[PDB]
Amino acid sequence: VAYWRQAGLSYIRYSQICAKAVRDALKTEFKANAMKTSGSTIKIVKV
Amino acid sequence: ATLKDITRRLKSIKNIQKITKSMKMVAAAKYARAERELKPARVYGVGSLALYEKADIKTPEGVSSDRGLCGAIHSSVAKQMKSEAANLKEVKIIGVGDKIRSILHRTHSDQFLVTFKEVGRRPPTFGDASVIALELLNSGYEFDEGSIIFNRFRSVISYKTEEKPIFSLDTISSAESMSIYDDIDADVLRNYQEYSLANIIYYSLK
Amino acid sequence: KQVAGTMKLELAQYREVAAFAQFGSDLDAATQQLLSRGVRLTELLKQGQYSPMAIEEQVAVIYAGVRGYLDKLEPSKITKFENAFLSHVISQHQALLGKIRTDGKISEESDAKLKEIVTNFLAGFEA
Amino acid sequence: KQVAGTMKLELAQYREVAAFAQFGSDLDAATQQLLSRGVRLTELLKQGQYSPMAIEEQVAVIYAGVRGYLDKLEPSKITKFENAFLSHVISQHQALLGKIRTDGKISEESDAKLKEIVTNFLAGFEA
Amino acid sequence: DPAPATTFAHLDATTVLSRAIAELGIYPAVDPLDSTSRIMDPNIVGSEHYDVARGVQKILQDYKSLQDIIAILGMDELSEEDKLTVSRARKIQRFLSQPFQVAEVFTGHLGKLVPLKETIKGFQQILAGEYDHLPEQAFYMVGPIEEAVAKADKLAE
Amino acid sequence: DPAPATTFAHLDATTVLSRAIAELGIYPAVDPLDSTSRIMDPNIVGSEHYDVARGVQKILQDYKSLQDIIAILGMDELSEEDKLTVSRARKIQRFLSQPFQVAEVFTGHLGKLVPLKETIKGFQQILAGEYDHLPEQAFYMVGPIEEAVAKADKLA
Amino acid sequence: DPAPATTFAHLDATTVLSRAIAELGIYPAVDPLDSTSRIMDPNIVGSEHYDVARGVQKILQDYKSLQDIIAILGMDELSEEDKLTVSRARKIQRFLSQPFQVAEVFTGHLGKLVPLKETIKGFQQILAGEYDHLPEQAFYMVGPIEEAVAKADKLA
Amino acid sequence: QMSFTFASPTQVFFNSANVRQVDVPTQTGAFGILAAHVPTLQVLRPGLVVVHAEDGTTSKYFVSSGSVTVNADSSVQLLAEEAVTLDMLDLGAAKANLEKAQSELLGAADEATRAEIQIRIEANEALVKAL
C-alpha cells in the first residue's frame, strides 16, 4: 500500500488525475488535440 | 400496379436512397478521422502487447457500438460469444455496446454483468477505455482469465473479428514462464496488469 | 439581375445538399454553410397574400440575405426582420431606394448606402 | 358487445402501433402493453373450418383474453388452450352458457362465475 | 376521377376524407392537408386562429416528411428537434379525432363537441410544448383539451 | 388477362408457373403460394400432409414479406429470428426443385420421382430444422431428402 | 414512348447538351459520355480514330469514379498513377472545349474550326502524357493542340 | 543496443528506433536503461524523460504516468497516458495549478477526495522541474 492506495483507489485513477495536470499545463498554440482527446463518453447502464 | 402506387413506392424509395447516400458520407468522414486517430493508437495499443506476446500463458483453472446499420460488425462478436458461451468454467457477460444488450438479452439474459452506452457516437479515446477497466475492479468481480473480442481493421471494405486474451487475475498473470523478469513485486504488477487492461481495452476500442 | 443571379445559384446549391439537413448535424463546415444560406434565402422568398412588392424594395430585401448579412439571424425572425427592414427604408431612405429604381442598377454608391442600412439596422434589431 | 365493442378500433391501432415500433428499440409505459396483448388475441380468431361456434362459446374464449386472462401466455399454445378450455366449460358448466345464450348478456352474476372458471385454469397448467 | 374532380370548383370549403387516416382509427378521417376553406384568412378568423391552424398543418406535414426516414432507418437516428416534432405531431394528430355523437354505436365513448376557442386553445398548447409529458393515447378520442389530461391519469394509475 | 383469368373457375387443382422462379433456375417453376387444390384438406390428405404443407406455405410467405427490407438494407439488418426464417425457407424454396425425367437434357441431372411419403417427410425435417447445418445448394435439384444430405457431403 | 422510340430507329448519332456541363463552363456543353455515334466502329472510321476516342472515353469514366473518392476519402488518396489519370482527364475535359466563330462578335475570342486529323492527334498526345508538364487551364478554350502549348508559354 | 518504442494514445514519438539508453521516472526514484539490461517490470510516477540517441542527441520529454517494459530480448517501450515536448508546455503557467492543489489538501477532511488530491500535489509539483 502507498500514498494513494489504502482507501481503495486503482492505479487507473492515479494515472488519470496525472494527465489532468499535464493538459492544464499547456497554451493555445498546442492544445487543439488535448481537449479533443480525453473524456468519459461512456455511460453506466445498470438501469 | 396502379400508377398511384408505383408513384407512392417510387417516392418512398427515392428518399431511402438520399438518406442512405447522405448517411454514407457522414460515416465516410467519421471513418476517415477514426483512422487518422488510429495510426498512433495502434503503435501504442500494440506495444501494450509486446509483453504478453513473448511468453504465452495457460491457466490450470465484446466490443462494438450502439448505432447499428453497419451490417457485418455486430454479428461477428456473437459468432464468438454465443459460440464461446458453450465452449467455456463460468465467465459472466461483460461487453461494451448497447447493441449487445439487444442481440444478447433474449438468449443470454442471466449472466449479465455490466453493459455500456454512448459507444460510437463520439470517437472513443483513452478515458473511454480506462473507465471500463476502472469499473471492472470497482465492481469487484472475481477475475480469473480474459476474453475480449473486437474487430481489427484491415480495409475500408473489410476488417476481421479477433479474439485476444488478457489475464484478468494477477495470480494467473504471474504464472511460471514469467520468471525471466525481476522485481516481481505483487504491487508493481498490481500496477501493470491493471494498466495493461485499460491498454488492451483501449486498443480494442480504437 | 445583380442579386437574383446569385440567389438562384445559391438556392441551387442549397438544393443539391438538402438531404443532409437531417442526417447532417455534423458535416463539413463548408456545406453547413450552404444549408444556412439556403434556408435563409428560402425564407426571403416567402411572401404574404395580396401584398405585391415594388422591384426596388425586392432588390433590397434580397440584397440583404444574398450578401451574407442575414446569416447570423434565426430563420424564424427573418420574415419579421424583412418586414421591419423594408418599412425602415421605405419611409426613411425613400432617398436611395427610389434611386435604385429609376437608375435601374445598384450603384457602386448605392451598394454602400445599403450595406450601411442593412448591417446597422440588424445590429439594433437583434439587440 | 361487452367483450368486443371497442376492440375493433383497438385492432386498428395495435395494428398501426406494431408497424411503427417494428424494430427492436424502446417505447414508453403506454405502448409496451398493446403489443404484449394483441399477438395472443389474434391467435383467438384463428378458427377451423366447417365448425361454427354458438355465440355463447364465442363470448367464452373472447372473455379469456379480452379481460386479460391470457396476457401472460406464449402465443404458440393459445390454440391447444382454447381447444380445451372450451370443451372443459361445456362438460362442466352448461350452466353459464345457459344464461348468456338465452338472455344474451353477461350479468355481474354470469361474469362472476367466469371470473373463477378462468383463473381456475391458468394456474393449473403453467403455475 | 372526373366526377369528384369537377366538383371542387363548386365549393367554398371542402372537407376531404382519407382512407389511410380512417384505417388508423382516427375518425373522423379528415385529411388535415387536403381540407380547405375560403375563409381561412387571418383577416377573417384572426391571426390567432389562422397562425395556429397553419402551425398544426405545418408540423403534421413535417412529420409526414420524416416518415420514411424513420420507419426504415432507425427512429432514434433523428435530431433532437425532430423526435420532438414527431412526438408533438402524433399527439396533435390524434387530438384531432373526435368521438361523434352519432357514432357512439361504433366508437364506444360518449359523444362530444368542442367550442371553437377551446379548439384553438387546445392545439395552441400542444403545439407550444405544454404536454410533451402526457402519453399519446390521452389525446385519442377526447373532447376539449382538458378531457385529455383526464385520460392522462386514467391511463396512468 | 380474361383468358387465363376466367379459366381458373374451372379447375380443381392448379399449378401456376412464374418466369420469376424459372429465371432463378428453380424448375419446375411452380409458385408455391399461387398453386392450389380443392383437396388440400386434412380430412382428405391426412393432417400430417396438411400440416407440413401449410407449414412450408407459411415459412415461404414469411420469407416473402421480408423480401423488401432484404432488398434495400441487406441481410444484416435482419433480426436474428428472421435471419433463420430466411435460411430455412430458402432451403424449402430449393428442395421443391426436382430434376424431371424429361429435361434430363437441360438439367443434365438424372430424372427423379419422389413418392408422397418421402416428400412429406423430407420437408417436415427441413421445417423442424434438422438441416440448418447443410449448405443451400444441397437441396437444389434432388430426389428424397437423402440425396440432399448426401449431396452436402460430396461438397465437403 | 412510341414517339421517341420510332424516331430512334432512324437515328445515327446523338449530341447531348447538358445544363450540367454548361455550368462547369465547358462550351459547347456536350456530355462526352452520353453523346454517341453509330459510326464509332473502328471498321468505319480509323482504328486510330476509334482507339483514341475509346481512350478519351475510358479516361473520362475512370476519372468520374475517383471523383467520388476524392470527394469523401482524400485528395491525395490516389496513387501517383491515379493522381495522374485525374491530371490528364481534367486536361482532356478542357481540350473538348472550343470557341465558336458565331461567338466572336461577342466573346472577342477568335473561333476555331479544327480539321479532323489535328483533333485526333490532339487527344492522342494529352493521353500518352505529352503534356503532364504543361499546366491545365491552358487547355481550356483553344483551337488545335498547338494553341494550348502556345498558351501556357503565354502565361508569363 | 536495442529497438526503442515510445508513444501515447494520442501520438507516436519514437518507433522501434535504435537507442543505446533512455531515462524514466519510476515508482522508485529514477531508473536508466542498460543497453542490455536485466528483465523487469515497473510502473511510472509523474516526471521527465530523456533519450540517448544514435547520433548522440538528447532532447527532453515528459510523462504523466504510464507503463515501461523491458523485454527479455533487445526491445523496450514506454506507454504514456500523455507526453508533452518541444514547446507546448507554456512556462510556469501551471505552477499555479500547484496551488489549487496544495490548498485543496486542506479543504477535504475526507480520505477518498483526499488521497486523490495529494497525488495531484506531487504530480503538479514535479512539473515545476521543467522551465
UniProtKB/Swiss-Prot annotation, chain B:
It is a peripheral membrane protein. It is found in: Mitochondrion inner membrane. One of its GO terms (biological process) is proton motive force-driven ATP synthesis. Keywords: Acetylation, ATP synthesis, CF(1), Hydrogen ion transport, Ion transport, Membrane, Mitochondrion, Mitochondrion inner membrane, Phosphoprotein, Transit peptide, Transport. It comes from the Eukaryota. The modification N6-succinyllysine is found at K24, K82, K117. The modification N6-acetyllysine is found at K14, K30, K82, K117, K160. Belongs to the ATPase gamma chain family. Component of the ATP synthase complex composed at least of ATP5F1A/subunit alpha, ATP5F1B/subunit beta, ATP5MC1/subunit c (homooctomer), MT-ATP6/subunit a, MT-ATP8/subunit 8, ATP5ME/subunit e, ATP5MF/subunit f, ATP5MG/subunit g, ATP5MK/subunit k, ATP5MJ/subunit j, ATP5F1C/subunit gamma, ATP5F1D/subunit delta, ATP5F1E/subunit epsilon, ATP5PF/subunit F6, ATP5PB/subunit b, ATP5PD/subunit d, ATP5PO/subunit OSCP. This is ATP synthase F(1) complex subunit gamma, mitochondrial. It comes from Bos taurus (Bovine). The gene is ATP5F1C. The chain holds residues 26 to 243 of 298 of the full protein.
Curated annotation (Swiss-Prot), chains C, D:
It comes from the Eukaryota. The modification N6-acetyllysine is found at K1, K8, K72, K80, K105, K113, K115. It is found in: Mitochondrion inner membrane; Cell membrane. Acetylated on lysine residues. BLOC1S1 is required for acetylation. ATP binds at Q47, Q49. The modification N6-succinyllysine is found at K1, K72, K80, K105, K113. Heart muscle (at protein level). Heart and liver. Subunit alpha, of the mitochondrial membrane ATP synthase complex (F(1)F(0) ATP synthase or Complex V) that produces ATP from ADP in the presence of a proton gradient across the membrane which is generated by electron transport complexes of the respiratory chain. ATP synthase complex consist of a soluble F(1) head domain - the catalytic core - and a membrane F(1) domain - the membrane proton channel. These two domains are linked by a central stalk rotating inside the F(1) region and a stationary peripheral stalk. Homotrimer. Component of the ATP synthase complex composed at least of ATP5F1A/subunit alpha, ATP5F1B/subunit beta, ATP5MC1/subunit c (homooctomer), MT-ATP6/subunit a, MT-ATP8/subunit 8, ATP5ME/subunit e, ATP5MF/subunit f, ATP5MG/subunit g, ATP5MK/subunit k, ATP5MJ/subunit j, ATP5F1C/subunit gamma, ATP5F1D/subunit delta, ATP5F1E/subunit epsilon, ATP5PF/subunit F6, ATP5PB/subunit b, ATP5PD/subunit d, ATP5PO/subunit OSCP. Belongs to the ATPase alpha/beta chains family. It comes from Bos taurus. The gene is ATP5F1A.
Swiss-Prot record, chains F, G:
The gene is ATP5F1B. Catalytic subunit beta, of the mitochondrial membrane ATP synthase complex (F(1)F(0) ATP synthase or Complex V) that produces ATP from ADP in the presence of a proton gradient across the membrane which is generated by electron transport complexes of the respiratory chain. ATP synthase complex consist of a soluble F(1) head domain - the catalytic core - and a membrane F(1) domain - the membrane proton channel. These two domains are linked by a central stalk rotating inside the F(1) region and a stationary peripheral stalk. The modification N6-acetyllysine is found at K58, K112, K117, K154. It comes from the Eukaryota. The modification N6-succinyllysine is found at K154. Belongs to the ATPase alpha/beta chains family. This is ATP synthase F(1) complex catalytic subunit beta, mitochondrial. It is found in: Mitochondrion inner membrane. The modification Phosphoserine is found at S47, S65. Homotrimer. Component of the ATP synthase complex composed at least of ATP5F1A/subunit alpha, ATP5F1B/subunit beta, ATP5MC1/subunit c (homooctomer), MT-ATP6/subunit a, MT-ATP8/subunit 8, ATP5ME/subunit e, ATP5MF/subunit f, ATP5MG/subunit g, ATP5MK/subunit k, ATP5MJ/subunit j, ATP5F1C/subunit gamma, ATP5F1D/subunit delta, ATP5F1E/subunit epsilon, ATP5PF/subunit F6, ATP5PB/subunit b, ATP5PD/subunit d, ATP5PO/subunit OSCP.
Swiss-Prot record, chain H:
One of its GO terms (molecular function) is proton transmembrane transporter activity. The modification N6-acetyllysine is found at K100, K129. The modification N6-succinyllysine is found at K100, K129. It is found in: Mitochondrion; Mitochondrion inner membrane. The keyword Transcription regulation does not apply. The keyword Membrane applies. Keywords: Acetylation, ATP synthesis, CF(1), Hydrogen ion transport, Ion transport, Membrane, Mitochondrion, Mitochondrion inner membrane, Transit peptide, Transport. Belongs to the ATPase epsilon chain family. This is ATP synthase F(1) complex subunit delta, mitochondrial. It comes from Bos taurus.
